[PDB]
Amino acid sequence: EPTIHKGLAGVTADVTAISKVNSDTNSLLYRGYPVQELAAKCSFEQVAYLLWNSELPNDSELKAFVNFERSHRKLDENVKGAIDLLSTACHPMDVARTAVSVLGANHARAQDSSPEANLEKAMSLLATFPSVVAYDQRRRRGEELIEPREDLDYSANFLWMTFGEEAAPEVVEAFNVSMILYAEHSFNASTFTARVITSTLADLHSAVTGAIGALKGPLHGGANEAVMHTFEEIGIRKDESLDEAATRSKAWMVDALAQKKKVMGFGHRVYKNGDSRVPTMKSALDAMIKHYDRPEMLGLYNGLEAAMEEAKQIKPNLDYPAGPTYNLMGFDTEMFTPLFIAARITGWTAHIMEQVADNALIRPLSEYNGPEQRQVP
Amino acid sequence: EPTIHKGLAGVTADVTAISKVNSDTNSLLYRGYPVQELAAKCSFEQVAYLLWNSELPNDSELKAFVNFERSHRKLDENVKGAIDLLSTACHPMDVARTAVSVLGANHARAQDSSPEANLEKAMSLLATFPSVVAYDQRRRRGEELIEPREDLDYSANFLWMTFGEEAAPEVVEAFNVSMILYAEHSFNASTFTARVITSTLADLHSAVTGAIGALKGPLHGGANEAVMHTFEEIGIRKDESLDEAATRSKAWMVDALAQKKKVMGFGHRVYKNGDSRVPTMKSALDAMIKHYDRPEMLGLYNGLEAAMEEAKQIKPNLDYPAGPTYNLMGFDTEMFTPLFIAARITGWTAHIMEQVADNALIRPLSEYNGPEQRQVP
Known part of the structure; x- marks a missing residue:
């Protein structure tokens, strides 16, 4: 009999250069840097850049990265239209899942998975996703969409679009820390789902949409x-x-x-x-x-x-x-997992790109325990 | 060093009673019955019932199953609305992915994963999905939606809604055979993606939406x-x-x-x-x-x-x-994978329910090969 690996417990599925998770020492490294240190002195933008580029950005690189981020936040017309076709009573994760699905579908480069295409799609997705979350909460509260502000960073803008008022320095700071902590975490269920979808050579948006589904569960995000x-x-x-x-x-x-x-x-x-x-x-x-x-x-x-x-x-x-x-x-409880998505988009896409660069279809075996061979009547 | 299992090749992830795939004898059993035999003398409806219930349906069971199927085909207003927000140039799989996402979001029992709820959602999804495919092809051809016909079986209706004219007996028969052959296949990438999403205790629609993403790739469906x-x-x-x-x-x-x-x-x-x-x-x-x-x-x-x-x-x-x-x-080439979805919905949902019944979070490990520990500047 073969060895059954329920839940792939203790099974090393692949190698990764993105992060190191150590149970013994309660440690987590993002491309070599301890998460506690990144959270203590970096912005989520720097951590996002780090996870994708394997290096912390210098002043000029960070400026360019921040410029692209702040100009790709606006909620696409069709994506908002899709959200408005969903009941204000449905689960926020199902709204996120739908929004990202529409984003991928209408993307000009949906079928291109080249490193450049995927990075552009990854960064654009990271930038626009907060508009989905903010509008989803506001629409449920009978309020309207609040446009992004280029003078606000990722975290300050996130809070701004959601509440329509700038948050306190301590609040955007605590929000920034949570984005960094949720950013990446090896082969968790949602990240692995993204890698399995990618292993088939399917696009980035297909992978993220599936990962969102996995992150939704109470056992996960x-x-x-x-x-x-x-x-x-x-x-x-x-x-x-x-x-x-x-x-x-x-x-x-x-x-x-x-x-x-x-x-x-x-x-x-x-x-x-x-x-x-x-x-x-x-x-x-x-x-x-x-x-x-x-x-x-x-x-x-x-x-x-x-x-x-x-x-x-x-x-x-x-x-x-x-x-x-x-x-x-001040966030509604139903919106907590979508906030996890917002951050984890960085880790998900970094793994998607890593998977694409050194691919092998992920397709395990199963051991049959059903009805023994029978003849069809 | 641990043993790295790239692509989980040769790794038995779990046990399953749904199907047995044998390389040595080029054989495939659906709940005990050889696929060749089911394809030779069963309808897809019987095979769909078989995969979910572990037994071929008797006359009365088949009648009830067929009655539910034929009355749950109509394309939901919001789902069609979502499809109409997508360009007629986007990939059909991205349309399927979006449609199922909206279907799950607006579902009255999206959060209930009880065996009864999941079966109802599974059967309703199987019934309505062909309307998504048919309309998606017709809209690209500048044509309009064709409503389902309760006097036509799954396959005949599928062809009817797509082309607006009933197909020849030989054609619906060859279509029925393809649905049966594509119905189920152990732990393939899309089915495994569905099980990973489910292992988190996320809902059926979340699982299927992720599986669709995986099925899209050229290495898979x-x-x-x-x-x-x-x-x-x-x-x-x-x-x-x-x-x-x-x-x-x-x-x-x-x-x-x-x-x-x-x-x-x-x-x-x-x-x-x-x-x-x-x-x-x-x-x-x-x-x-x-x-x-x-x-x-x-x-x-x-x-x-x-x-x-x-x-x-x-x-x-x-x-x-x-x-x-x-x-x-007569199908457009871009629509071939969505046709695979239509059939595979049966196998996907049967695995989703099987996973829910004997769950364990699927979360493997990775071996780090990135930058060695560095201090943040």
Whole structure:
């Protein structure tokens, strides 16, 4: 009998020069640079450039990159039209999936996968995607589209188009950090989906559209939305002693755990000792707790993670501190995963291009366990 | 060092009860039944029911299944609207990808993945997809949508909506055979993409939308369109002696082979001794050659396969005889892969449901070979 590799656990599918994920040391390198260091002193734009070019940009390279980014943000007429054909009650990920699908379809160079074509498509997609997210949230709130501002950077513009008012320096900074942390992460389900689609020699947009579908699930990127929904189930409140928070948090967890349910925002396929991005994202969460003056959040937050460690020895992942952060920022919970897409577009496309450069069709085998050979009547 | 499994070649990713693919004996079983036998005496509807239910339908079950199918064919207003926002010059697969994305987004039960919900979504999707393909081809020809006919079966209706005239018995029969042959095929790239997306607990439509992206590539389903494009490059002609066909076919192949190019419609990741579906599809192709009275096709067809066997000892795959078949039927070459989708929806959704029933996140590892750890300046 062959060895069955359920979920491809522990299976090395390929080599990659984009990032290194180390469980033992809770470390993550983006083309050699530790993510904590990039988050501490780089803009998402620099990190986006880094992931694609394998090097941090010099002043002139960054200027050109930033100029292209800020001039490719406007939401295409047909893409907006497609979003308006979708109900304001459908899932934001399905809207993102549709938007990117239309973007790829009407793209002048949809069929060209040359390094130059893919980079241009990748950068243009990264630039325009935030307009999809911002408009999707505003339309649900009965509001209208807000045009991009060339005087605002990626993060400041993202917040601007969504809320129609410039965010505080601390807020755009905490948002920038989350984009960098979510940017890239080896062969996760969505990135691998993108590589499988690419392995067939299908285009970049086809790959991203499939990756978006994968990122949607609660076991993947959908965990950030799930984390916040969970905090909404349990009462948020204010004034309640830490007893309320911890007793109720553990109580919600106790009830979920006894029902054999998984608690989202905890655990990881690779990280067995803690997420490399958690300390950084938690620091951003703390900055936001302080900024919006809402220490109440921590009650439920601390209580649930303490209870998980105690009951299952499972530490939180990036989605745990990220959900509450976007909540404080004013985003609707359903929009949390689309925010992950916005950032992960960088990692997805870098892998798509890497896959194209050293391709081999990805097509595994299955072991049959169905009905034995029968003759058709 | 770990063992790198490029393209997951020879890697058994999971177990499956849906189909068995055997290279040694050029065999393919659909829930126990040999595909040749199902193609010889079953309708696609019976095969669709078989793949989902693990059993061939009895008279009453088939009646109910057929009744649901024929009443869920109409193209949804918003889906057509989305197609009309796409240029008549974009790739048909990108139109299919967009259509299914909109279908999933506006679906009342998009977030429910229960066996009942997924089956209903699977069957409804299978029923309505042909309207997407038919309208997509007709709109490009400056024609209008043709409504479904409840008095016509899946195949006859498919041809009806596309051409606006009922097809000959032999034609709907050869079309039915191609749907059955394309229906299911273990862990191919598109089906695996669907399982990876599902492994995240994302919805059925998200999975199918990603699978469509994967099926698009020339190395996968896109090979059927590529096969015909190749026949178009080389002159089709009539009257030319078999010398014209064979000398020119080998010549085109000789020039492609010397340029290190791959010839589409030949080779397979699993089948090393011939495709289990080729003899059946070739028989359908022959039936169509006879029906439309066009023996000229065989000149180029025979010559190219003979030349491939001689030069590379590589036999044709299902897409080789399928492309010329759909061409004779009157479909535009760009529409060949969407026809593959129409059929493969059955296999894709059966795997999606199987994945949901015995889930494990699919997330492999990568081996880093990028820049060694550097400090951010």
